[PDB]
């Protein structure tokens, strides 16, 4: 099975998927984030951040507190299972993480922690 997904986020504050399936036979999984807009990361930054569903709100709220210089993530946030960097227009970042961090049955969400953006950029991730 494939073990990677390509995701883009634009200047219009949306991602091109709200649902990712990670096949249980994958040992690692990769997400390739790109930003086809024209606006820079201080104005229209996007990241891809993964946590349990239960943990999403806190990661988003603490990340907003932390500011651009932290990529809008609380330092040392152990709720964050995996994430990309925060990227702007014309940039790309990939993250590859161990599928051993995920369990069949548990409920996960991916999301963008740039202020306001999780209102529209978020989705489920499932191990299947
Ligand atoms: Cu495979
Ligand atoms: Cu964003």
Number of domains: 1
Strand content: 25-35%
DSSP strand count? 8
Determine the fraction of residues in helical runs and give it as a percent range: 10-25%
Listing every helix as H and every strand as E from the N terminus to the C terminus, the arrangement reads EEEHEHEEEE
Query: Please, how many helices?
Result: 2
CATH class: Mainly Beta
Structural class: mainly beta
Q: How would you describe what is shown here?
A:
The chain is mainly beta and 128 residues long. It has two helices and eight strands. The chain has helices at residues 41-44, 56-66; strands spanning 4-8, 19-22, 28-34, 49-52, 82-83, 92-98, 108-111, 122-127. The strands form two sheets. Strands 2-8-7-4-5 form a five-stranded mixed β-sheet, with helices on one face. The longest helix is centred in the middle third of the chain and has 11 residues, at 56-66. It is globular and about 40 Å long. One copper (II) ion binds next to loops. It is classed as electron transport. The entry lists the keywords Electron Transport, Copper Binding, Metal-binding, Periplasm, Transport. It forms a monomeric assembly. Azurin C112D/M121I.
What topology does this entry show?
Elements: E1 4-8, E2 19-22, E3 28-34, H1 41-44, E4 49-52, H2 56-66, E5 82-83, E6 92-98, E7 108-111, E8 122-127
Parallel strand pairs: 1-3, 2-8
Antiparallel strand pairs: 3-6, 4-5, 4-7, 7-8
One copper (II) ion (CU) binds at residues 1, 3, 25.
PDB class: electron transport
Keywords: Electron Transport, Copper Binding, Copper, Metal-binding, Periplasm, Transport
Assembly: monomeric
